Design an enzyme around this catalytic site. Structure first.
Site, PDB file in Angstrom:
ATOM      1  N   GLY A   1      30.007  52.668  24.477  1.00 18.36           N
ATOM      2  CA  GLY A   1      30.226  51.413  24.861  1.00 18.36           C
ATOM      3  C   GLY A   1      31.619  51.177  25.576  1.00 18.36           C
TER       4      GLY A   1
ATOM      5  N   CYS B   1      32.705  52.975  27.788  1.00 11.02           N
ATOM      6  CA  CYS B   1      32.789  53.266  29.409  1.00 11.02           C
ATOM      7  C   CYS B   1      32.548  51.960  30.308  1.00 11.02           C
ATOM      8  CB  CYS B   1      31.741  54.234  29.833  1.00 11.02           C
ATOM      9  SG  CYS B   1      31.855  55.885  29.196  1.00 11.02           S
TER      10      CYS B   1
ATOM     11  N   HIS C   1      26.196  55.868  35.791  1.00  8.37           N
ATOM     12  CA  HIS C   1      25.449  56.489  34.293  1.00  8.37           C
ATOM     13  C   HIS C   1      24.971  55.139  33.540  1.00  8.37           C
ATOM     14  CE1 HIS C   1      29.579  56.143  32.203  1.00  8.37           C
ATOM     15  NE2 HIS C   1      28.713  55.744  31.147  1.00  8.37           N
TER      16      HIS C   1
END
Ligand SMILES: *[C@H](CC(=O)OCC)[C@H](C[C@@H]1CCNC1=O)NC(=O)[C@H](CC#C)n1cccc(NC(=O)c2cc(C)on2)c1=O
Ligand SMILES: *[C@H](CC(=O)OCC)[C@H](C[C@@H]1CCNC1=O)NC(=O)[C@H](CC#C)n1cccc(NC(=O)c2cc(C)on2)c1=O
Lengths: 302, 302
Positions: free
Chosen positions: B143, B145, B41
């Site tokens: 942020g 992830c 993603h």
């Protein structure tokens, strides 16, 4: 987005944890440039605990008397002195993994991460707070002494704790990296007691400010109150009293949530009186006071 | 000697955390030899979230489309593929701080440390457990992830988690380092729900075994019971049921404390029925189930 008790990353310190053996007795020490700091009680035998003369016990030792190993590779000792309750051992080699660092003396209610070590190897890492009575609620087995507490600040490592010993209640005592103990404690197997412990009021608040930012607002109420009324309740429930400095310090979290420090205190005041009715704040069923204002933002803002 | 929730030391992983930017969107990734794993993603724009074609969105990219920085120094990308829900980006350079490692897929109730990172830098570290409903109760900002979960085993690092996203309840979902999600979750801003969560029964027990070793025996009783009676109560209180394997596994802590797994279960059974009467076990006012048998010994024995 979640609220966990979280430690600073340990790598920088991991690379500083050497094994120190003196005779039979073996504990951890900290290797910054060409110095190795470790507890002075490394030089004790099982007997030299009730009542040991360190200055004396030490006058009966030389550089080669102490064995310092990095993982498996020995450091040659070339200097050995007493720094209050620590030993400052000079070594042939300066540590290649020594970070930017300073030695600081945290005030009670201020927090640090502990890196729990055995035979120079790190075993795990956990956050805790310096109690008002000048103790720590750590987890520490025999051989854990030498284990350090620290705060990171970008690439700078601030050392604040070295572990010396356990006290009656099941609580932990030790010193700054100047070898100067925290509280009124001494490196001997005498009967020493921690004073009665209070609750770090400021931290409890910051923790509600965090509950709020984490969408947990139930315990909020309309009531306000003055620093004066709140301090009277605080005494009852063995809470550390609130200084206007403390309320100024909660300013950023105050503005950040649109809850006035004193509106929040009023909410707390109520909680101290009206239990929690088997509810949870951030999943806790008691008031968490091991979280500083600073801890709270850092986690909830970058 | 104390019982804390404690993480593994982070250093080994710290040296593996690179920044990955693709267009504007910037998250963390893991650099093992000449591969960089990060969530797929990364290639999404704010819109490519409700319903994104990854295979497609990706077919619209090349090696130079992605920017990988170690602290500040860029890694040249020379290969970019999809590994289920991750990207596997090949790089010019192989990581000099890559440890011995393996990729494993922990079962629910098994624990790992998380290293929470932002723009490739580690921000903090905390323990948690993989819930029965296949979720995590982490603390994770935007942020975060790319942040990883892991178990150390001497010098070997076992990677089990990469963070992808938050779910309704305030809980966290992600994947193994094969890019295969945990539970039935997908990398999209749809309405997905975690199932109802049960309590990890085995862990709750290990935690009492630990309370006992830490001199906390009040909740102990005389009553025993059979795995059969206990399972009936477990269902009521949404506890995961007990398999004889589980009781065998508690063997070492059983022998170690001279409390028979089934004698302990009888104590628990009672606690599930007879509240806690505002007492504390190891200072908790609820039953802690985020501690494995293995966690308990490791801490209480070396
Ligand atoms: C240091 C461990 C180490 O590496 O040194 C040996 C090689 C330990 C840490 C202790 C062990 C158990 N939990 C801890 O935090 N410190 C000591 O054992 C010190 C040594 C000094 C100085 N020490 C010595 C003798 C007795 C005690 N304990 C008590 O005073 C005490 C009394 C009651 C009740 O509970 N503890 C002690 O800490
Ligand atoms: C990844 C952060 C990152 O580095 O990527 C951006 C550069 C985040 C982690 C989240 C942020 C807040 N807490 C977290 O754990 N993941 C996402 O934001 C993902 C992206 C994917 C896939 N994502 C995208 C869109 C929506 C959501 N959220 C939900 O589905 C949701 C619904 C409810 C209620 O709560 N969350 C999401 O996680």
């Amino acid at each position: 987005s979640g609220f966990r008790k979280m430690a600073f990353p340990s790598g920088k310190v991991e690379g500083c944890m050497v094994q120190v053996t003196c005779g039979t007795t073996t504990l951890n020490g900290l290797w910054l440039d060409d110095t190795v700091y470790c507890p002075r009680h490394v030089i004790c035998t099982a007997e030299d605990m009730l009542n040991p003369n360190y200055e004396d016990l030490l006058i009966r030792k030389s550089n080669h008397s102490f064995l310092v190993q990095a993982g498996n590779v020995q450091l040659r000792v070339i200097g050995h002195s007493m720094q209050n309750c620590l030993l400052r051992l000079k070594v042939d080699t300066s540590n290649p993994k020594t970070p930017k660092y300073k030695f600081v003396r945290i005030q009670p209610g201020q927090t640090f991460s502990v890196l729990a070590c055995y035979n120079g190897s790190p075993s795990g890492v956990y956050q805790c707070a310096m109690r008002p009575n000048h103790t720590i609620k750590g987890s520490f087995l025999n051989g854990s002494c030498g284990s350090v507490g620290f705060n990171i600040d970008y690439d700078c490592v601030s050392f604040c704790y070295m572990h010396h010993m356990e006290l009656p209640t099941g609580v932990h005592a030790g010193t700054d990296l100047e070898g100067k103990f925290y509280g009124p404690f001494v490196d001997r197997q005498t009967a020493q007691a921690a004073g009665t412990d209070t609750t770090i009021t400021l931290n409890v608040l910051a923790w509600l400010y965090a509950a709020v930012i984490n969408g947990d607002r139930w315990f909020l109420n309309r009531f306000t109150t003055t620093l004066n009324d709140f301090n009277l309740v605080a005494m009852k429930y063995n809470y550390e009293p609130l200084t206007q400095d403390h309320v100024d310090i909660l300013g950023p979290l105050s503005a950040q949530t649109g809850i006035a420090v004193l509106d929040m205190c009023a909410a707390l005041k109520e909680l101290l009186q009206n239990g929690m009715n088997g509810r949870t704040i951030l999943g806790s069923t008691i008031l968490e006071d091991e979280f500083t204002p600073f801890d709270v933002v850092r986690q909830c803002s970058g």
